[PDB]
Each structure stands twice: as structure tokens, then as C-alpha cells.
Amino acid sequence: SGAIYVGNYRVVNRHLATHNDWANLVWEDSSRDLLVSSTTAQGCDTIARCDCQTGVYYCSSRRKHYPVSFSKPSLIFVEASEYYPARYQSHLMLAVGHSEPGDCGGILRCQHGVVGIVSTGGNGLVGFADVRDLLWLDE
Ligand SMILES: NC(=O)[C@H]1CCCN(C(=O)Cc2cccc3occc23)C1
Ligand SMILES: [Zn+2]
């Protein structure tokens, strides 16, 4: 579990979105596993606007932060799940690192701010849904 809070927005994994998130929907994309909903309170996360390929993520299943090198956002095949059929997930970045299903929502950050959130994993890999292209999150 986990979310990004920036301005009047809440960014979460689309497969973990709540009834409240869907009742206050701003935008959602199944191909990215992202959903953004509106909030009454003000968010203070800084979103990174960069092409960094190194950063640090939070891994809830270990209660620890890990440094990682990660790939550029791209279309990566993801096996079928209870939430989606087998498909290519777009805007996804992979890294070598520990992850378990409950790790989704953990933030990945570089020196510039929030890069994205854990969205996939398995076999010593961890996948992050990128958020750096969503320029509208700031205004
Ligand atoms: N974006 C998707 O389509 C997700 C939906 C839920 C399932 N999923 C996973 O990758 C499950 C998983 C296994 C093992 C380590 C994992 O770390 C994070 C997630 C995960 C794909
Ligand atoms: Zn950066």
C-alpha cells in the first residue's frame, strides 16, 4: 500500500484504488496501473521532472529503503492477475531489488523528488509506474 500526495491530488496504484478514489476520480489509466483522485487537504510531495536512472525506494516487506538503478519508462509484459489479464503495462521501469505484492505503492525517489510508485515485481526484480511525465500534477 501507499500513495503520492501533491497539491489537491492523490496518486495510487489503480488496482488498489478505494470507493472514495473512484467517487473523486480525476484520471485513470489501466495500461499504467495509475489512478489519481482529488483531495480536500493540501499535498506537499515534490514530483521529479528529470531522466534519472538511479534512486531509492521503500520496500514495506523489509521495512527498509534500498538504492537502485532502474530502466527508462517502457512497455513491459505483465502476467495475468486478479486485477488485469496478461498485457503490456506502459510507463514501467524495472530494477533489481526485492519486492512482494503488498509492496505496491512504495515510493521511488531521486535527488529531484518523487519518481514513481511500486507497481509490479518478482524474481529479484521490482517495477515502478513512472509519474514524471504527468506535468499537470503541479498545476
Ligand atoms: N501492475 C500490475 O498489473 C500488478 C497487479 C497486482 C499483481 N502484480 C504483481 O506484479 C504481483 C507481485 C508479485 C511479486 C512482487 C510484486 O511486487 C509488486 C507487485 C508484485 C501485477
Ligand atoms: Zn531525478
Side-chain angles (χ1 to χ4, degrees):
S1 59
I4 308 167
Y5 292 95
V6 54
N8 282 272
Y9 298 121
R10 169 175 135 94
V11 188
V12 281
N13 293 88
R14 193 196 184 271
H15 72 269
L16 299 181
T18 69
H19 283 315
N20 201 54
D21 288 327
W22 278 101
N24 285 306
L25 179 67
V26 167
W27 167 83
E28 54 75 33
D29 186 336
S30 297
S31 77
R32 302 179 59 153
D33 185 39
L34 291 184
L35 179 152
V36 178
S37 59
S38 51
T39 67
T40 60
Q42 202 76 32
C44 288
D45 289 324
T46 280
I47 312 295
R49 304 296 181 198
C50 69
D51 82 346
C52 276
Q53 280 185 250
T54 65
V56 173
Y57 77 108
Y58 180 65
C59 166
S60 69
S61 69
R62 287 290 181 271
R63 289 180 198 160
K64 273 188 168 87
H65 294 263
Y66 290 105
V68 281
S69 298
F70 52 90
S71 67
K72 284 194 149 109
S74 72
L75 271 167
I76 290 154
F77 171 88
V78 179
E79 214 164 348
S81 74
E82 26 175 89
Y83 316 100
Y84 305 112
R87 78 212 208 285
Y88 291 99
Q89 174 163 321
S90 66
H91 297 268
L92 186 58
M93 301 170 300
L94 299 191
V96 178
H98 184 69
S99 65
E100 303 180 38
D103 286 327
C104 287
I107 279 164
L108 171 60
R109 294 185 75 91
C110 57
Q111 60 186 112
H112 305 105
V114 175
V115 173
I117 48 167
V118 177
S119 167
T120 70
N123 302 319
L125 298 164
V126 52
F128 306 99
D130 184 54
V131 305
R132 304 174 278 189
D133 57 317
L134 309 174
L135 309 183
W136 55 266
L137 288 176
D138 289 313
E139 57 239 22

